[PDB]
Amino acid sequence: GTLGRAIYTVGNWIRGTGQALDRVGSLLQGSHRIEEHLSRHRTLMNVFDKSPLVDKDVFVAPSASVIGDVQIGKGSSIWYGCVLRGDVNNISVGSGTNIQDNTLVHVAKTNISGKVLPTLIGDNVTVGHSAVIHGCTVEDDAFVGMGATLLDGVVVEKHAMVAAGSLVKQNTRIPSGEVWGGNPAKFMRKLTDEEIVYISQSAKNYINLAQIHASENSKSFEQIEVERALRKKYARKDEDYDSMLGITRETPPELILPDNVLPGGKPV
Amino acid sequence: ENPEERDRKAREHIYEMHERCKKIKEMWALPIRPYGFWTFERHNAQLRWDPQISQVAGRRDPYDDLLEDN
Amino acid sequence: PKVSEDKNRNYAVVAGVVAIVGSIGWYLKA
Amino acid sequence: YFNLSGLILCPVLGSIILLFIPNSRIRLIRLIGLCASLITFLYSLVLWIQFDSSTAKFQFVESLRWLPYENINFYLGIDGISLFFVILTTFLIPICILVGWSGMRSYGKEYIIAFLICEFLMIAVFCMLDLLLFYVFFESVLIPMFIIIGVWGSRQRKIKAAYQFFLYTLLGSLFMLLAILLILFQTGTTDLQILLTTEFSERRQIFLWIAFFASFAVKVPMVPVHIWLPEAHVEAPTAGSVILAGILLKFGTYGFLRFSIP
């Protein structure tokens, strides 16, 4: 009531004094420090009357930048720092195809070689970290290693692998079952069936892993505070005192991950 | 420094230091148990409390209560 | 929204103000 | 008016200022340490100028109470014997700082801080006129030199040499401390001006002289205890050897000149 109003007025006076002190301290600094501002980074951005068509189930990290004419299929994911600039031409990410951290997918100017085609990444493909894609046509069920660079004109066929740290030269086709790699990107060896199983399992594991990141990067301020309080409260445990009190403190469901992301599916 | 003041200070320092030295040696000469510390007032408290509780039941001379009737 | 709602927190603020004022008076009056 | 207080407080301020400076600012640390050492050296040179050379009384005397009954107190004074030792011990420190100029990026602030604490503790040794506190600052030099030998040694042998030096110094120190205690109990004070005017009995003179010799002969190696000096000298930084050879070997001679012989 009256006490609450008085305390509110005192708080207003204290806030005013604090802001005045902040301004004075900024003046003494010589106005050399550039003040932090509200975030102006747009996750999804239009360029030329063109909008991305990100699907409902896609996980697009807040630090990612899906720009221009980008079409992303169900179940796929775009991870932190990844850039998909489709301003000049089209980029079509398939279903289940995840583009990993700091990866760049950019399409050519439709005339880099005269008969350029858009970047068509297929289904269930996985692209490694820091990879660079500049106009490829990666077919479905493929693997691009981390750090690999695919120049314009290349076509990674189905069930083919590009080794990490490779440079696929322009107009180079990787046949099915090969593991082409190296800076010249020459033939290395044939793929075993275990490698194919590994590719499929990695794609499915990343599909299952994108869900917890999506559920964590979209929480509101109120939910974040509650989860932080619960995490602090259950960080350390004391079974002796709980047994002495006859209680059993159990971790809340908000701090439990699905068993499909644990190393071996640990229920207990 | 003024030569007279320095010498005067030195002599005064020696003299006062010798007096303080004698005082501190006599201080160390003091025994741990003072001469008749049981004679002190702080160490004589039963002599002042027992007369006040002399008539309390449980401490009386047996013949005391036999004469308090009259 | 010019009202502080938490009654317990308001009493803590009042107690802190009283403690500061009393400490200042104690250091001044004696 | 230049007195013994400022000459001792200058290294104190120099070491305090470097104590709260970020280690990334390597240039500032070196500049401030060198400036403090040079200011202390100039202060000593000025102290030389105003030194009277016709009086045997101690000059620039300063006092600060230590025991509540003024039995023992911080008495600071210089004479014609310990003036040049103070000048030398303030002159050697800037040279020690300049020696490790190039490599100072690796040692850090703890190097110059250690040398400044060394200077502060060695200026007070040559200026103390109280027997007990002369021992307190006499054997306080171990910690800075222990750190200097161990932390910034050359090879893995640095652990052994530090142990040997520290152990010999302790063996001398406590056997001298017993004599200091016996003198304090009998005389009543530990002031040099009073201990030089007290007639000691003939029997007690030999025992006290031997006990004083035990601590001093280690720091001025005569014959049987000269086995720590070579190892400590070789297993020491270049500036560290200058301190051990320039000043720390002058404690025994000064101790004999100031206390034992009178």
Next chain:
Amino acid sequence: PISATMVGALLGLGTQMYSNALRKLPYMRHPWEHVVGMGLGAVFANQLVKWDVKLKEDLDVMLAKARAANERRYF
């Protein structure tokens, strides 16, 4: 000269920045508690001197009483 107020203030600032250093924090982490520590150090040093004077007076009185008690042995 060196008064108790200035040595107390320096000790308070030093102990505040020493506490900040011990916790791997910047020296001047919270500027207000540095001022608080300076004030508390000055107050503590002044109170220490004021207590030391009274303590010496009381010790002198007790020692006078002890010497008087000892001196009576000779009668």
Next chain:
Amino acid sequence: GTLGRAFYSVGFWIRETGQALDRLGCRLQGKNYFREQLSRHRTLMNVFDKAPIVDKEAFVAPSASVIGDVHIGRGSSIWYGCVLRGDVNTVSVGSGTNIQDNSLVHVAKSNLSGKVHPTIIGDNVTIGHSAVLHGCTVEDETFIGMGATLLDGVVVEKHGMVAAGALVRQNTRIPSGEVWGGNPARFLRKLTDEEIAFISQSATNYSNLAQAHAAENAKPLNVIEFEKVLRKK
């Protein structure tokens, strides 16, 4: 200098005291909105006096990180994800250049390797995607390939092309008109007139595209999105 740094640190002390007072005032009123974990990223970050000098008609992406003494010419562009960090020395970016997406142009972090050479970028210079320029100096009208890793002490002459994926070793000069590629970088072929014309036109194409991206980035922040994020149930 040293006098300025003391005033800067005192400014931090006073600003911290003011912010603490503001937080205390918020807490008396019951508000706790200061606890929100907002991103502290600044597209232009200064290190004491060293602050980036960016021309008015230069596109800098909001996610690009420019730190220290960095100079951007008129018509240049720093695209998404770039990190232009010059602190021990300066990073000079000319006019008409285009640091493309996820590219790194930084200077050495210590003097142990020797002297920190400033990074200089000419005019109409095309830096490829994910290209790391570490203390080099490229002349104008040159092309740096995708994934290139130019090291320090490297001079790329006028009309010089560094092939994609190449790694130019330390203290290497690429002669004018020659293409250097592979690991390590070695001479491969001489540039043709058509490639020179394409290099000239790519700079203008990206300069025109950066204007459109800047126009789309200068639009007022959407309020519908802000309201939607505020109410999440």
Next chain:
Amino acid sequence: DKGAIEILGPYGISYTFRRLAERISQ
């Protein structure tokens, strides 16, 4: 130096404290 002075010194034979401190468990 390396002989009698060292053996009778602090570590030639005075290191028996290792053979003396370890016996304190009794």
